[PDB]
Design a protein around this ligand. Structure first.
Ligand SMILES: [Mg+2]
Ligand SMILES: [Zn+2]
Ligand SMILES: [Zn+2]
Lengths: 195, 82, 1139, 280, 153, 96, 49
DNA sequence: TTGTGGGAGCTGTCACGGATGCA
DNA sequence: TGCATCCGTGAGTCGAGGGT
RNA sequence: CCUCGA
């Protein structure tokens, strides 16, 4: 049965079938909160367990944490005032921001996620600019280059999720390929040429 | 017809952050708490938030219309200050 | 000017000295003619009449005259009355182009026709002029304005009508079966096929296969006449031996049983249906294209009458005999009249069987549909009314025609939002060739054979410029010198050769005609008179193969080496030194460069820049010679020689469809005399009339502390301080005050709970003030909405009850600045119902605010050369950190070495070397004679002044020997030092440590573009925001402040990690646990522990959908009972009351 | 630099000699003694040989400190085929159908292809991009099927204590005194737990059962003169629902024995699907 | 499988797949392929049902075939394709999300199937801790308390 | 209210008794809403009587718009004053 | 055997085969088949409606 | 509800398995 | 009652923006 | 749905 433009009408069965159906599109995978995306750039000054989070992105990601620490310290009268201050990007938040960022891991992902190394945990450090800084040694696992690639940031909230990030999924804890045991966080082309 | 993906049809509800700050109260929550007597505070808070009938607020505090309707008229003029 | 100056025909063109060694015997045609000629044919313009009389057919017929002649006369059942249409006419345009873009209108002109009504009964003639509708017009640039937006109609690649044979090899019996397809212009298809059982079967549109003899017996043929014409293959005989119908009457009966099944067949329904199905020009038509195809392939009626265009009995007999002979190894044939017809199968991808439907034909088909529906209405109204009252005005209902045109321009895949990043993008967009659409093939039928380069594409469709993603091979672009046929085929020009002498007579050929003759190459030696110099020349033969053939046997020659490439592709210097993938990437990324505040033509070009800029339309060109009378930033007025004046206004800081800035600047002064065809003003990405898509950057090829690692790019901070890579971006925000149930929305300055500071930049209306710098979240337009007495918050009910305010309870719905946006408000437009401004139903006021931002180059911004060398900026270094030359000059861009050799794009290095020479100029030593390497050089290249613009055409550019020679005689700097040796390298100092770098580094000047993938547009984040209604999951996309998709593969990765709690949190309290997300916000705001996950709402929705599918699905507890999954909401009330 | 891209100084003579050979094949075809398929096959042989020869001349003319040579031979990036395409000759180009064309691209990218050479090379380029698009989706579908069929396999116990396993070749005894090491050891015997003891003829057990069989254990087994070894795999695991850690063996990622909760099924599906994009 | 047996077809399949992957320069350890091969040979075909409720010619897990036999019957080893083995899974919810949702749901309704909700994919769908990694009862239920020597200090 | 610890999830064919037990009413009209007032038509595909009220604690005919009446059924329009959330969990039915 | 599959599935369970024919059709709640007001008098619905 | 009046638009897809349907 | 045919499966992931 | 990015 066709509607306007000879287009078949989506039936009750279509809702379940296909990649667009409920199973593939809403149950085996979903859109999540406390998450962002940006273009990656190489940061060689980074350590294997570190990554560069743009300041605006980190502020939005950690917004309620920043508000709570902004009311703990007397910068904010109440929580609505803290919300208004974080929204207006007031100068006081940034000192607070780096405080709530310390040792709170984030998850970096680059699609297509071919193996589990396609998602790795990093410690974020605030970076000036709007680009994520990615360690040059994790590019083999992500199959990442800097021809325009983008990556996604997910923020674990629960204590168990933070623990799984710091222990299981931490960048510096997964150096070897889970497929062949060979090193992936290995010196690549430029570093090779140099050595 | 809708767009090809039905999941891009937005719900028109307030967000968790939006429903948190909207359910609480501003800084005047300490004006109606301490500056007013508990006779005005309890009668004004239950006649405007809950919207009970004038005889239902008469039943909660064991007071007639003469007490409930008065504590409301005077609690509003009390809270008109500040 | 000398011959080495490219684009000498264009007056006032910059003097770009070209390395070319071959003469240009034909100029690039109008690059927009693929659009304008099509539309002018549709109209019937005088510009089209002159061309149709000069070199077209002797009889001119317009696109609308054709539909009218096909439509008139309209008659009734008794033939008692007739109505004919004639003389399509257009009035003036309703509004200018800018007024149409402003008011969200459609640039159109009214259409009129002469509707003559004759009455065979009362003997009268009733002519009349009838208004047909508002026909959308094509602008000068070849575009359309629809509902306020600019659009391009892309030509479609479709199967030409005709007869096409295909053989299919089968595993079973190993026999090669054969099938025939008859594709008409209108009407349903018929098909022929020999089965596995050697049974020749004929198929109708959607019907079971019937014996071919049934069709002869459906045409009344005798059983002996079939044996006289066929049976030489014996397959026809054995098909007639198979049990089939008996006689022609039962044949028509059973064939009328096939069509319209389930209906009681008769003996007259067959006579009525078979006549109109394939033999009546009212329901079946293969146009002059299809008639020509079937007549040339089958040898039918070669005496060139084109009177009737409809499948005839002769055609069907010839086609069935063709199939019979093709099943056998018969390779030749004759018919009763057929003269030397080969017997082959047809290539569907060949450009002789694959034609183009341009914008004219695409619109003509929709007009034909609307006209047929109008004719149905006319015939239905003719019977009902009386002769005393009917008139050409009352019979005609124009609504279906208008509806068809509107629906075409608004819902067709071929009417596309114009790509307006820069002039080049739009220029190639109008020359695009799309394979998909209505009548073309489906996306699910786009096999690999459609997508790859066909040999017939040479000189017609470029083999390089094509999408890198899922549309690869489905979207081509017309070649430079290519041209579309009246039949719809693509022709390319070739120089004619007679007895080994290449003349200047140009002949345009179709792929069909090209496969007959012998076509040489443009790089072939020629005598001063025009004669070949080699004993044998390289030539292209029929199958697409190449060989060497003596000069006495060559027929045609390529007009230009550039003949096979498109415009964008022809703009890549040293294209021949690039691999096809990187060349494709460069062609695509040229169409993605943003316009900069200041244009700068490339030092190294190919000569296509001038013509591309001019034909793109975004440049202002003198329509007639004269003298400038006045020149302002606003307009340029020129006094002609006869006394008339012409004034050209300037698009100043205009937003494009993609937010880039179209800003034209006059390049003439008050006294200047300009020629017709000369560029008067420079639009976006143009410099003195040439396409200037990027900047000439000082580049050093070397690694640098791993900041340019893995395609990343390092930039000197000078590019920020001096704004050399700065661009302007304009965004349009809009809001509307409309009607609601509880009242009417209002645009006001008075918004509740808002300080006077955050409203300072608003006027009295509630609209931001022009010139205000708005930040992230600032109010652009204030707007309040009536609110119901149940939506009020607890703090709101108190303020409403204590004060007893008015019944107009309003919620703040003001238009605010989205995240990541900022700039100056440069324009405001407002529409109100108080004025005659038209608005949709129930919309009181409609206001648009235009915000402009100046984006300097930043980290994350994407740059690219013209050779597919793309990369993002990883680090902007201070001018003191950059490696600097011996004289103190710091390099501007550091490109990593490891990228160049493996990507197979070495032209980017050659461009660099030449880029240095042009920057410093040269002086070839000719005292002891002109050197040997410099022999082929034209005399204008033996010396060059600094910053010399230079053209290196593709396949005729600077040779390696000449380029190596130029690096030796590089003129020195101001101090007499030669900074770049003859290897193209130089000794740089490390501006950080101070010590010089140990080895020389290749430095030069490379053309770098700012691609429209800027980090300001990509960066996005979200803690919490709007959710989907149907599934309660976060919305998607940045524009909706949506969350990121955590897909199935990401969950696989999580599980492989064994991170169970992270996976549960991501899928419950971050997506659709409607209570868990609010409890999470509360816990984080109060430093409490994150709560326990709930039940995903999407799972509830799945259960409800299964129950809607009559599936009793139930959740069972540990004991066997059913678990009710519902909510009670007292907890919120308890907490809020205890608050 | 254009100077660093050296052109082999013997390219012209190599191509002339092989053009003579191709002309002999063309005259054998004009005679009628050669088949058209034979003509194409002979020409493909000739031009593959000529490509290899200009590549040899290229690598013999290049000094080993040349940057294009340093980049490839150090393992940094690229392969010598690209170097030969750049400085030497492109070689044979495929058809839209997949076959090779009798006439090759004799030009290098440093010299600049001709018009017809560029147009012919485009066929191969386009077909390669499209076929890569296809192979990505095929590999994705296979990976999804593997993930679904294998997501039951998770480790649930430390050791099912079964004595079953599979025998694996560690080496082969050549007629010489040398012991030809097996190529599959990196993927067959490495990172396995030992099933039964590996004892030499008249000697003590060199590796006890239950050992990780790492590089030290493999090298000790090889120096001991052992040529076969029985290992415990998940093919012979006696665990009811999942597999046991000892039968699975070492975790490739962590280098130690696999932990309990590890869902080695998904890890295996991903390890099989991830390099699928490279198959042809 | 029929002639030489299951522990031979396993070697055959592993070596063939490894040959294909090695012909292109791919180094995948054998255990990854073996984990996949194992899930093909998990079921048997019922030749003669006998005293059992199994229908003849049906594919039953070897665990059910070996445990259901309470003598108080005839099973032949089966090689199975990954799609076939996936669709024949323990959990109808798991199979509905893989392929052929309509057929799976119809046959689940007719057979009045009941999903025991044990398996990582099903837990993903319903929002429960997957039974693997940190979700198994060994690690997910741990008692943690400070010592007395540390409570004193 | 309930942590997702369910033993099994069972599926089977739905008898017409199941479809009637689920349903909160019978849809009888093709009309969807009133184009003028944006108010759902009665017995239609969006009927507030059977599916639920569009707005929280508000009945169709307006007699009850307050949380005090929570639980009652408006005798004029048949709408239950409750949360609009129920509008995504209350199924209707069509008698053939 | 093919027929016995379905016949025994209907037999052993106590599921009546009558369920394969319907006398009333379930209607999914409106929020899962949304109707939204578009710009102007236009409206948009899912195909289910 | 009287005197006539039957459609769009598609195929340019490929590989595989098993119920269906006819010889 | 023995297959050939026809019909019904499946065909990568994530992003941006614009439309009906 | 289209065009585009990796
Ligand atoms: Mg990339
Ligand atoms: Zn085991
Ligand atoms: Zn009511």
């Amino acid at each position: 049965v066709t509607g306007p433009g000879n287009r078949p009408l989506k039936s009750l069965s279509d809702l379940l079938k296909g990649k667009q159906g409920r199973f593939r599109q809403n149950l085996l995978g979903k859109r999540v909160d406390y998450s962002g995306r940006s273009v990656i750039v190489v940061g060689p000054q980074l350590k294997l367990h570190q990554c560069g989070l743009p300041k605006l992105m980190a502020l939005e990601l950690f917004k309620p944490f920043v508000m709570k620490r902004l009311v703990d310290l007397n910068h904010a009268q109440n929580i609505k005032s803290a919300k208004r201050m974080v929204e207006r990007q007031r100068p006081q938040v940034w000192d607070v921001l780096e405080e709530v960022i310390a040792e709170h891991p984030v998850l970096l992902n680059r699609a297509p996620t071919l193996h589990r190394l396609g998602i790795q945990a990093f410690e974020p450090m605030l970076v000036e600019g709007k680009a994520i800084q990615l360690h040059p040694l994790v590019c083999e696992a992500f199959n990442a280059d800097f021809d325009g690639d983008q990556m996604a940031v997910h923020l674990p909230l629960s204590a168990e999720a933070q623990a799984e990030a710091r222990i299981l999924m931490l960048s510096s804890n997964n150096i070897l390929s889970p497929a062949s045991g060979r090193p992936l966080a290995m010196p690549r082309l430029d570093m090779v040429t140099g050595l | 017809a809708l767009p090809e993906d039905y999941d891009r049809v937005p719900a028109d509800e307030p967000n968790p952050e939006q429903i948190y700050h909207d359910a609480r109260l501003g800084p005047d929550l300490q004006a109606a708490l301490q500056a007013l007597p508990e006779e005005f505070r309890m009668a004004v808070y239950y006649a405007d938030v809950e919207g009970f009938p004038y005889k239902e607020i008469a039943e909660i505090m064991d007071t007639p219309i003469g007490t409930v309707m008065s504590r409301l008229h005077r609690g509003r003029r009390q809270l008109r200050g500040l | 000017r000398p011959q080495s100056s490219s684009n000498n025909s264009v007056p006032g063109a910059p003097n770009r000295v070209s390395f070319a060694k071959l003469r240009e015997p034909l100029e690039v045609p109008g690059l927009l003619d693929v659009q304008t000629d099509s539309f002018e044919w549709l109209i019937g313009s005088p510009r089209w009449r002159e061309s149709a009389a000069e070199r077209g057919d002797v009889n001119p017929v317009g696109g609308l005259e054709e539909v009218l002649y096909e439509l008139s006369p309209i008659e009734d059942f008794s033939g008692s009355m007739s109505l004919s249409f004639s003389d399509p006419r257009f009035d003036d345009v309703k509004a200018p182009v800018d007024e149409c873009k402003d008011k969200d209108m459609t640039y159109a002109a009214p259409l009129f026709v002469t509707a003559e009504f004759i009455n065979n009964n009362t003997g009268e003639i009733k002519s009349q002029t009838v208004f047909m509708g508002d026909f959308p017009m094509m602008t000068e640039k070849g575009t359309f304005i629809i509902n306020g937006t600019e659009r391009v109609v892309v030509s479609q690649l479709v199967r030409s009508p005709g007869v096409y044979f295909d053989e299919t090899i089968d595993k079973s019996t190993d026999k090669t079966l054969h099938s025939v397809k008859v594709i008409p212009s209108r009407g349903a298809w018929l098909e022929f096929d020999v089965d596995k059982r050697d049974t020749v079967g004929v198929r109708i549109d959607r019907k079971r296969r019937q014996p071919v003899t049934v069709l002869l017996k459906a045409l009344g043929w005798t059983s002996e006449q079939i044996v006289e014409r066929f049976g030489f293959s014996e397959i026809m005989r054995s098909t007639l031996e198979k049990d089939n119908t008996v006689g022609t009457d039962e044949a028509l009966l059973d064939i009328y049983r096939k069509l319209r099944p389930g209906e009681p067949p008769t003996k007259e329904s067959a006579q009525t249906l078979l006549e109109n199905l394939f033999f009546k020009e009212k329901r079946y038509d293969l146009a002059r294209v299809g008639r020509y195809k079937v007549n040339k392939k089958l040898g039918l009626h070669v005496g060139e009458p084109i009177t009737s265009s409809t499948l005839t009995e002769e055609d069907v007999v010839a086609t069935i005999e063709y199939l019979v002979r093709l099943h056998e190894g018969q390779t030749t044939m004759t018919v009763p009249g057929g003269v030397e017809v080969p017997v082959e199968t047809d290539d569907i991808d060949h450009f002789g069987n694959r034609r183009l439907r341009t914008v004219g034909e695409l619109i003509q088909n929709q007009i034909r549909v609307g006209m047929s529906r109008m004719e149905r209405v006319v015939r239905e109204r003719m019977t009902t009314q009386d002769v005393e009252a009917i008139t050409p005005q009352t019979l005609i209902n124009i609504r279906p025609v208008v509806a068809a045109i509107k629906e075409f321009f608004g819902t067709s895949q071929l009417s596309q939002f114009m790509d307006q990043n820069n002039p080049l993008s739009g220029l190639t967009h109008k020359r695009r060739l799309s394979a998909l659409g209505p009548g073309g093939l489906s996306r699910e039928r786009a096999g690999l054979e459609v997508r790859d380069v066909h040999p017939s594409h040479y000189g017609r469709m470029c083999p390089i410029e094509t999408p890198e993603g899922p549309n690869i091979g489905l979207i081509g672009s017309l070649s430079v010198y290519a041209r579309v046929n009246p039949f719809g085929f693509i022709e390319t020009p070739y120089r004619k050769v007679v007895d080994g002498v290449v003349s200047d007579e140009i002949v345009y050929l179709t792929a069909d005609e090209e496969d007959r003759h012998v076509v040489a190459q443009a790089n072939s030696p020629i005598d001063a008179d025009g004669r070949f110099v080699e004993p044998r020349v390289l030539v292209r033969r029929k199958a697409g193969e190449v060989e060497y053939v003596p000069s006495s046997e060559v027929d045609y020659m390529d007009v230009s080496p550039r003949q096979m490439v498109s415009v964008a592709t022809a703009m890549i210097p040293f294209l021949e030194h690039d691999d096809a993938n990187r060349a494709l990437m460069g062609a695509n990324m040229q169409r993605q460069a943003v316009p900069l505040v200041r244009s700068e033509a490339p030092l190294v070009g190919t000569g296509m820049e001038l013509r591309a800029a001019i034909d793109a339309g975004d440049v202002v060109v003198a329509e007639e010679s004269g003298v400038i009378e006045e020149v302002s930033a606003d307009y340029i007025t020129v006094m002609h020689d006869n006394g008339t004046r012409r004034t050209y206004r300037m698009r100043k800081f205009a937003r494009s469809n993609h937010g880039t800035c179209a800003n034209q600047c006059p390049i003439v002064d008050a006294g200047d005399r300009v020629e017709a065809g000369q560029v008067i003003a420079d639009g976006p990405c143009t410099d003195d009339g040439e396409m200037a898509l990027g900047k000439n950057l000082l580049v050093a090829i070397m690694p640098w502390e791993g900041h340019n690692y893995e395609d990343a790019i390092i930039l000197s901070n000078r590019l920020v301080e001096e704004d050399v890579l700065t661009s302007i971006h304009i965004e349009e925000h809009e809001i509307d005050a409309r009607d609601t149930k509880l009242g009417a929305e209002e645009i006001t300055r008075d918004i509740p709970n808002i300080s006077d500071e955050v409203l300072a930049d608003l006027d009295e209306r509630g609209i931001v003030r022009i010139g205000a710098e708005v930040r992230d979240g600032d109010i652009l337009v204030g707007k309040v909405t009536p609110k119901g007495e149940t939506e009020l918050t607890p703090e709101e009910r108190l303020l409403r009850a204590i004060f007893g305010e008015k019944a107009r309870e309003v919620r703040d719905t003001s238009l605010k600045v989205p995240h990541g946006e900022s700039g100056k408000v440069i324009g405001i437009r407002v529409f109100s119902r108080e004025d005659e401004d038209e608005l949709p139903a129930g919309v009181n006021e409609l206001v648009r605010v235009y915000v402009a931002q100046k984006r300097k180059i930043s980290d994350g911004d994407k740059l690219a050369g013209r050779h597919g060398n793309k990369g993002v900026i990883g680090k902007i270094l201070p001018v003191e950190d950059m490696p600097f030359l011996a004289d103190g000059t710091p390099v501007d861009i550091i490109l990593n070495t490891h990228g160049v050799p493996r990507r197979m794009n070495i032209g980017q290095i050659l461009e660099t070397h030449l880029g240095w020479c042009a920057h410093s100029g040269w002086k070839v030593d000719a005292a002891k004679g002109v050197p040997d390497w410099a022999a082929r050089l034209p005399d204008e290249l033996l010396e060059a002044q600094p910053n010399a613009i230079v053209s290196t055409p593709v396949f005729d550019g600077a040779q390696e020997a000449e380029l190596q020679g130029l690096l030796s005689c590089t003129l020195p700097n101001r101090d007499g030092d030669v900074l770049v040796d003859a290897d193209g390298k130089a000794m740089l100092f490390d501006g950080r440590s101070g010590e010089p770098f140990p080895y020389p580094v290749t430095v030069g000047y490379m053309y770098i573009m700012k691609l429209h993938h800027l980090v300001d547009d990509k960066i996005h984040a979200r803690s919490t925001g709007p959710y989907s209604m149907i599934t309660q999951q976060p919305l998607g996309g940045k524009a909706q402040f949506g969350g990121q998709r955590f897909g199935e593969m990401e969950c696989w990765a999580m599980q492989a990690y064994g991170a169970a709690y992270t996976l549960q949190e991501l899928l419950t309290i971050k997506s659709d646990d409607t209570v868990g997300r609010v409890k999470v916000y509360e816990a984080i705001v109060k430093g409490e522990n994150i709560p326990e996950p709930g039940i995903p709402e999407s799972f509830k929705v799945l259960l409800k959908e299964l129950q809607s599918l009559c599936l009793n699905v139930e959740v069972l507890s540990s004991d066997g009972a059913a678990i009710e999954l519902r909510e009670g909401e007292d907890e919120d009330l308890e907490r809020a009351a205890a608050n | 630099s254009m100077a660093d891209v050296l052109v082999p100084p013997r390219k012209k003579e190599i191509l002339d000699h092989y053009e003579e050979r191709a002309d002999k094949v063309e005259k054998q075809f004009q005679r009628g003694a050669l088949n058209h398929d034979e003509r194409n096959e002979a020409l493909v042989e000739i031009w593959k040989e000529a490509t290899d020869e200009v590549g040899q001349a290229l690598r013999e003319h290049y000094p080993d400190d040349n940057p294009i040579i340093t980049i490839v031979d150090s393992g940094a990036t690229g392969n010598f085929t690209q170097t030969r395409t750049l400085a030497g000759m492109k070689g044979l180009v495929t058809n839209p159908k997949g076959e090779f064309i009798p006439r090759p691209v004799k030009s290098s990218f440093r010299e600049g292809l001709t018009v017809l050479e560029y147009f012919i090379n485009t066929h191969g380029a386009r077909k390669g991009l499209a076929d890569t698009a296809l192979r990505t989706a095929d590999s994705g579908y296979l990976t999804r099927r593997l993930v679904d069929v294998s997501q039951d396999v998770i480790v649930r116990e430390h050791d099912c204590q079964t004595e079953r396993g599979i025998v694996v070749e560690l080496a082969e005894r050549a007629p010489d005194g040398t012991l030809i090491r097996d190529p599959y050891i990196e993927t067959s015997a490495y990172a396995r737990t030992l099933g039964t003891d590996a004892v030499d003829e008249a000697g003590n057990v060199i590796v006890e059962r239950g050992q990780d069989l790492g590089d030290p254990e493999i090298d000790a087994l090889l120096a001991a003169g052992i040529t076969q070894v029985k290992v415990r795999s998940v093919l012979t695991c006696a665990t009811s629902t999942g597999v046991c850690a000892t039968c699975y063996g070492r975790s490739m990622a962590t280098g130690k024995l696999v932990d309990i909760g590890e869902a080695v099924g998904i890890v295996a599906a991903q390890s099989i699907g991830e390099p699928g994009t490279q198959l042809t | 499988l029929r002639v030489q047996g299951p522990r031979e077809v396993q070697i055959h399949l592993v070596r063939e797949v490894q040959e294909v992957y090695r012909a292109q320069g791919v180094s995948i350890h054998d255990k990854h392929i073996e984990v996949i091969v194992r899930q093909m040979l998990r079921r048997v075909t019922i030749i003669d049902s006998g005293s059992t409720e199994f229908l003849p010619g049906s594919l039953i897990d070897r665990a059910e075939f070996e445990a259901e036999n309470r003598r108080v019957a005839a099973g032949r080893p089966v090689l199975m394709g990954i799609t076939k083995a996936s669709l024949a899974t323990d959990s109808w919810l798991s199979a509905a999300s893989f392929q052929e949702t309509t057929r799976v749901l119809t046959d689940a309704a007719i057979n009045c199937r009941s999903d025991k909700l044990n398996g990582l994919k099903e837990n993903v769908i319903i929002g429960k801790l997957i039974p693997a990694g940190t979700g198994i009862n060994r690690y997910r239920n741990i008692a943690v308390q400070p010592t007395e020597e540390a409570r004193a200090a | 209210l309930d942590v997702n610890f369910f033993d099994e999830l069972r599926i089977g064919l739905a008898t017409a008794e199941d479809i009637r037990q689920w349903s909160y009413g019978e849809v009888k009209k093709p009309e969807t809403i009133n184009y003028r007032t944006l108010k759902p038509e009665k017995d239609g595909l969006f009927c507030e009587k059977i599916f639920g009220p569009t707005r929280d604690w508000e009945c169709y005919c307006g007699k009850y718009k307050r949380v005090r009446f929570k639980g009652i059924i408006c005798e004029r329009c048949g709408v239950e004053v409750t949360r609009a959330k129920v509008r995504r969990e209350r199924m209707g039915h069509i008698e053939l | 055997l093919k027929r016995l599959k379905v016949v025994a599935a209907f037999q052993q369970s106590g599921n009546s085969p009558m369920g394969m024919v319907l006398d009333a059709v379930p209607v999914i709640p409106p929020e899962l088949r949304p109707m939204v007001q578009l710009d102007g008098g236009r409206f948009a619905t899912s195909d289910l409606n």
